[PDB]
Amino acid sequence: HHLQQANIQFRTDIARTEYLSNADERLRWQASSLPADDLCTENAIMLKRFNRYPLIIDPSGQATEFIMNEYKDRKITRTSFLDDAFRKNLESALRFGNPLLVQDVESYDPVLNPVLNREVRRTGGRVLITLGDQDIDLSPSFVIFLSTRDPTVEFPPDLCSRVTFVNFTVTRSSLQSQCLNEVLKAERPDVDEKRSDLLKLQGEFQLRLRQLEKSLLQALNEVKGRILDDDTIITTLENLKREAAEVTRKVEETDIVMQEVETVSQQYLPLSTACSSIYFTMESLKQIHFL
Amino acid sequence: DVVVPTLDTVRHEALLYTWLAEHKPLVLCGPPGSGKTMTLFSALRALPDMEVVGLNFSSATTPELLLKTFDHYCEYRRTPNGVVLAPVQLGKWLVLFCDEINLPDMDKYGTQRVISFIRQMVEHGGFYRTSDQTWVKLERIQFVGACNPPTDPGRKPLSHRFLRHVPVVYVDYPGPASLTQIYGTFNRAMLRLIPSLRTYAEPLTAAMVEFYTMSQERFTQDTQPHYIYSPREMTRWVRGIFEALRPLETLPVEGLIRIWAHEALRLFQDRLVEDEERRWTDENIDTVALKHFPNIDREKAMSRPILYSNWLSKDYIPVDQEELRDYVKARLKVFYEEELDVPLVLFNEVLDHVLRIDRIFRQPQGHLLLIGVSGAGKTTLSRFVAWMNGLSVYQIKVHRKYTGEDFDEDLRTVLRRSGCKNEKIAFIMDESNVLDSGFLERMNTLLANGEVPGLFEGDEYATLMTQCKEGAQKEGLMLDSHEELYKWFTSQVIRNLHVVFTMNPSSEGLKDRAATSPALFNRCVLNWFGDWSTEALYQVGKEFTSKMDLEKPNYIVPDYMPVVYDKLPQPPSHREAIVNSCVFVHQTLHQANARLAKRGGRTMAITPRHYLDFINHYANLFHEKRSELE
Amino acid sequence: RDPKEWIPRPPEKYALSGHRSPVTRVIFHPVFSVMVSASEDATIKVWDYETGDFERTLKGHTDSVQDISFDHSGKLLASCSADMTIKLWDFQGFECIRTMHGHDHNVSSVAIMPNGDHIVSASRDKTIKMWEVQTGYCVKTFTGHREWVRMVRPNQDGTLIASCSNDQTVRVWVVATKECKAELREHEHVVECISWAPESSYSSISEATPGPFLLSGSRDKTIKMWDVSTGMCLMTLVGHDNWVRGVLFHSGGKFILSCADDKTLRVWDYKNKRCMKTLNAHEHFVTSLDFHKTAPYVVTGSVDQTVKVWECR
Amino acid sequence: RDPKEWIPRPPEKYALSGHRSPVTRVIFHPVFSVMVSASEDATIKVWDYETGDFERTLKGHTDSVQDISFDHSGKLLASCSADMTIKLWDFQGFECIRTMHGHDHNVSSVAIMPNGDHIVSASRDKTIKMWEVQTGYCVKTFTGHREWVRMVRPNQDGTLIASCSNDQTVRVWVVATKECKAELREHEHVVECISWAPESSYSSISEATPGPFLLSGSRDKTIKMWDVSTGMCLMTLVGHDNWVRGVLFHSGGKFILSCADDKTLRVWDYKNKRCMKTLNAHEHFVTSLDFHKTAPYVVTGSVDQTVKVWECR
Ligand SMILES: Nc1ncnc2c1ncn2[C@@H]1O[C@H](COP(=O)(O)OP(=O)(O)O)[C@@H](O)[C@H]1O
Ligand SMILES: Nc1ncnc2c1ncn2[C@@H]1O[C@H](COP(=O)(O)OP(=O)(O)O)[C@@H](O)[C@H]1O
After folding, report:
1. Which of B309, B314, B327, B492 best tests the C interface by mutation, with the highest count of C CBs <10 A?
2. Which of B226, B349, D225, D230 has the fewest CB atoms within 10 Å around its CB?
3. In this structure, which residue's CA is closest to atom 1 in ligand 1?
4. CA dist., res. D247 & res. D254, Å (int)
């Protein structure tokens, strides 16, 4: 509203999640155990595009598994603040250039203050940071993540300045989708498994269509000659014909997906509405008697 | 030590000589900074038999502090009639000046341990050594005290059984008709290097009167807990003016009024919180210097920045903002290669703050007390100023399980590096570095006295004397014994150690700090940095977002025009409109934090580090999406 | 005129430009009419000061070249940079002969004593290293400073060296005995530049107050004279408005040529306790200067990437 | 030797390669020892010509660039391309500053007059546009050309703007008065390149056949020379066997180095009115050439994806 009142034009018909995240990165995030709701996608964007090292509040535990499945090739060492071998693990993470996930930041140690504040000495081309009493060669491929399990934690402003907060709260849409999925697992299992398989099929055919567009664009960007005189462009035409056949095939899968989701919607949508209402009563009931 | 005698000064001098000639206790009550330790130190200088031991009480005061004082300055001796406590200076009379008698905490059952302890050694003349439960009798020990009135917020009244053995004399502020000649003789001293300005000297002192009365009229202690005004500020005024025109040797009336206004703005505007009282003090400065100094060039004598630096030239000269800003850019370019490679942005308040920090850092016993939110660049500016003045910077490196012994060892290393090797040390520690009450008690003692009782004991005591005699023989002084060697070490610690304490503002935290620690509000100069205002946010936004491409030559200025940064130039460009929009984003989340808190949800601290995170994410997103589209 | 009465005068004879970074050190070749400068863009630019043009480029370093140095012959050069390297170049063929390693931090300054068989170096690791020019091995190691050593410089015969450091002390060591002969601690700020006294100045400082004598410029905006055999501050000259970056004796033994961060070049007479001449040198901080030992030429290298050459009159 | 007589010699000092397209224009930096090349792959490449090292690539234009122009400070770089955009580059920051729109066709040229305030732009739409640099607005417009305005250059004083077009005309205008001072119609073909005469050539032209003077090279295998004040062709060089693509004066004002489409880099003197040396530079069409004012180097940008640097001797 301030941008509209100040005559600064913005992309109105663009989702805030879709402008930042690519489709293949969204597919990789869906592969890394993340829920498909927009809030967890936004939080995945925050973890992707951090500038200050993030503090992740998570009352359910899904963000820890998402971070583990995200940086799985890069060996994340999982440690905690009250662990006895925490400073040695941090020193090994700084030396090795390893990603590091640290849990239980409610028991925060001030010794991580110069690493979080990025106070870094430049020994020429070498990079050295004084952690504690020891000067460690900081490899640039180091990240840290400060986990929290309890949602109702207050924080000092000295720690609050240096971190970017990421809250994995429970939305009505994600809860309704999870309850619909478990109701479909309990009641109509064949429809549930073929719906999951068809969703995977729709995702990989959309990936194949994007691969078509990228490959054809980069092929025609460097033909460096006549397309008609080159017979390789006829093979590009055959590739176009095959992927047009697959994008025509995708409509039948879309129709079967539509029939399945309308059947399960008219079957079990008020049930999921009751799920959302009862769990929001669960979350709001702490306002009565504190216990 | 320069005390010019007034009526109340000599009356209380005769009173204190009467109370102190009989080795009788006395309590100098009154408002803080009214000269109660001036009058006491004038009474002690009349009789050379009496030697002073300074002690400063806190809210968390224990008689173990007096036990450490007796361990240092006195000895236990065996006599046939008991065990006696006597000063190591035989024939002299030791007097213990406790600074904050009303301050130790009154318990749930209506008592104070230190007050009852002092009453026990005054009514009965001795105490109980708890090492073997033996009655020690004081041989040559008397007590004097100073306190604020008990009607002050941070002070508590004393027991009747304690004041049954002590008289109280109540000093007051000298008032305007005494301060006019008190600082008239000071200005008649100080305007002797310049023989032409003395015809303006006597109204100028008179000028320094009236502002102070409005400083006592509006800025009450109910407004802010650090709103106390004492003749120490006028002493700071005259020594700042004296150190201003000390090396200059040429100045007209306009420069004198400029120096007076600059000292007044550095002494009466830094302690203020909001900009309303800052505007009121600047308006008071304008009307007072117009009233007492007519027919003078108001444009030449008074301008906007009024900054005084000695970085560009060796003399304390008035300088413009732009040359100072360019020198600060070049010095940051030098400084990034030496201590810390953390980039710094500037605005006008950044230059003003680093001039305040350098101005307090230049003097010996320069202690800073910074008030500001976390992430506002409080310690980075102090690091830059301390590097530029050639001061080594020390942080305590706080980790988990930081007891008092590690802090005592850190303070031992700081004092040995400062007072023995004569190395200038800027001692930096945060409000989160305070974990125990002993931390604040030892910091209060170090800030007030410049020495800690019982910090060095056993073999480290003799190690301190060997290091101090080696440092004195390196310096050139032929020293001996332990008492005068400790005096020389204390003088070196006073000269070389600069302590900066930084917190965040709070409605209850600062109110409790004003009671639990006097020396942070009595011996430290307060600088209220505060949160970044809209002008600072617009300057950092417009100064980082000038490199990228933002300009629309066809831009329609909207008629609605939501303005949150004042003095937005019309017709604004696209960059000005979107920098004002960024300022609006920060302001509306400032409003949203209170909107979330008033519903019942827990709020989280908004910092300028978040704004520097938001503006840095602008250029990273703009350069990515522009290179994506191309 | 005579070599006694050379004084620089405005304006400059030449204003050479071309560096991508602030110029850090400029000196003269002793035999041929060659001038050489270095900067923070990892390059060494060789010019001809008599004709005022570009001659050669030497690109071997990776980081900011802090200081370069000559020998008694002028055929050999040593340079140091921030990559913990020391590069030993020649002059007759313009190639990098050796690359010594071993320093922990930024090698700030190098110098060669006039015997030419050895090379001294100062660095940020609070050590001074002493390398063999025939083997490229640090043979000796002076240690005892408390902070970063700014630059080191040896005396005329190679028996004494002096180092100004970030501990606000100036330490004069003996080469053979490896012990700090004089520890001069009267400066308050960091001492950034030092200089030795020539033979013809040996009487003249005694006129102002044998030896050995030593100049020292610090960040406290003062230039101090020291006697090693006494150990006291012989005189102090004030008048520089900012941090002094380069201090050098005149070849006549009577003037003091100095530069600071006030964009000025100052010529002092220490007999009259004053700066006789002040010249506007650059727009930014004048990092280094040099006086030519026989011809009337003064070179000034500065932050703003221009090297100014002044003809002395 | 002096910079006066400098003629390049085979072979090339360096053969820079890495462009994915023909090279359209190459220019030297005025003060630094680096050169910038423009090519049809919309990549503005920066190469160090002293060591032959590739430095950087600026990619802001979304179509093929034609002409690049520095300023005499070396801080701002003006670049034109066929995307209806002009781009201003901070050379010290290596990022774009502003993008200019308003041309409806291929912006075939861009230049900065020596007053350091505006930008010339010749384009395919038969007009020339004036651009304000700091604000970013199109101010003035030369109109009167009837064909493709090939390339434009302002005079050394900043009061004359000369442009060649495809209608066999060389049109010299005054900057603000908007009149065609000289509509020279003597060339038989499209004039593709002009070169403003330096001051030292002003005598040398005047005794070959005062001022101001102007060069031009066309597709009729001829390079004509014109007096601006009179308005006629004084002299003509013939001897190229194809289209002359770039014509360039010597910095000393005697020789003219010119590249033509017959794989020839020929040097011409107006005293003899012939070609003394012809160099076979590349293996394809040679588009542009450039010669340094103080350095003995000629850079040559050609279609064959290589940029060749040749030492002048
Ligand atoms: N007549 C006077 N002569 C000299 N100084 C005075 C006079 N009256 C007040 N002062 C100044 O007032 C200040 C009061 O400070 P101080 O006595 O230290 O406060 P406190 O007694 O609360 O510790 C002194 O620093 C002193 O310089
Ligand atoms: N004016 C500023 N310009 C650039 N960075 C700043 C500025 N102020 C604060 N910062 C950032 O804040 C961080 C340190 O904050 P700090 O000074 O510790 O805040 P505080 O002292 O209030 O705890 C640094 O990493 C620095 O990048």
Report:
1. B314
2. D230
3. B4
4. 14
Distance between CA B409 and CA B411 in Å, rounded?
5
What count of other Cβ atoms lies within 10 Å of the Cβ of residue B401? 7
Place of tokens 């035409």: A237
Question: Is the shortest distance between the CB of B505 and ligand 2 below 6 Å?
Answer: no
For ligand 2, atom 22: residue with the closest CA: B374
Q: Is D147 on the interface with B (CB under 8 A)?
A: no
**Of the residues B380, B529, B612, which should be mutated to test ligand 2's pocket, given the most ligand atoms within 8 Å of the CB?**
B380
Q: CA of A148: how far to CAs of A291, B516, D212, in Å? A: 20, 34, 78
User: Does ligand 2 have an atom closer than 6 angstroms to the CB of B609?
Assistant: yes
Please enumerate in sequence order all residues whose Cβ is within 8 A of that of A57, keeping only pairs 6 or more positions apart, or say none: A148, A151, A153, A165, A166, A167, A168
Distance in angstroms (rounded) separating the CA atoms of residues B75 and B480: 20
Token representation of residue C5? 């009465």
Experimental determination technique = cryo-EM
Side chain identity, residue C82: A
d(CA D122, CA D152): 6
Is the previous residue joined to B176 through a cis bond, with omega within 30 degrees of 0? no
Q: How far apart are CA C267 and CA C261, in angstroms?
A: 15
- Work out the burial of residue A233: count CB atoms within 10 Å of its CB; fewer than 13 is exposed, 13-18 middle, 19 or more buried: middle
On whether the CB atoms of residues C170 and C181 are closer than 8 A, the answer is no
Q: Is residue A200 less than 8 Å (CB to CB) from chain B?
A: no
Please tell me which chains touch D, using 3 or more CB pairs under 8 Å as the contact test.
Answer: B, C
- Spatial contact of D194 and D164, defined as CB atoms under 8 Å apart: yes
Contact assessment for residue A148 and residue A55, using Cβ atoms and an 8 Å cutoff: yes
Is residue B245 within 8 Å of B317, Cβ to Cβ?
no
CA-based nearest distance C19→chain D, Å: 7
Other Cβ atoms within 10 Å of B110 Cβ, number:
7
Instruction: Say yes or no: CB of residue B616 within 6 Å of ligand 2.
Output: no
Cα dist from D309 to B56, C60, D12, D289, D300, whole Å: 79, 22, 5, 10, 6
Among candidate residues A183, A204, A200, A201, the one with its CA nearest the CA of residue A192: A183
**CA B235 to ligand 1: nearest atom:** 27
**Neighbors of chain A with 3 or more C-beta pairs under 8 Å:** B, C
Between CA B122 and CA A174 the distance in angstroms is 75
| Separation CA C242–CA C303 (nearest Å) | 15
- Find out whether B143 and B137 touch, Cβ atoms under 8 Å: no
Residue B354's φ and ψ, nearest 5 degrees, are -75, -25
Rounded Cα distance, B497 and B412, in Å: 13
Q: Identify whether the C-beta of residue B142 lies closer than 8 Å to the C-beta of residue B24.
A: yes
Q: Is the CB of B376 under 6 A from ligand 2?
A: yes
Give the separation between CA B114 and CA B156, rounded to whole angstroms: 13
Q: Distance from the CA of B376 to the center of ligand 2, in angstroms?
A: 5
C17: which chain D residues are within 8 Å (Cβ-Cβ)? Answer: 31
Nearest one of D212, D196, D205, D200 to D164, comparing CA atoms: D196
Contact B575, B551 (CB under 8 A): yes
Report the nearest-CA residue for atom 5 of ligand 1.
B3
Closest Cα partner for B589 from B566, B614, B619, B572? Answer: B614
B610 lines ligand 2 (CB under 6 A): no
Of B179, B53, B66, B73, nearest to B115 by C-alpha is B66
Resolution (A): 3.8
B33 labeled part of a ligand binding site: yes
Rounded CA-CA distance B446/B54 in Å is 12
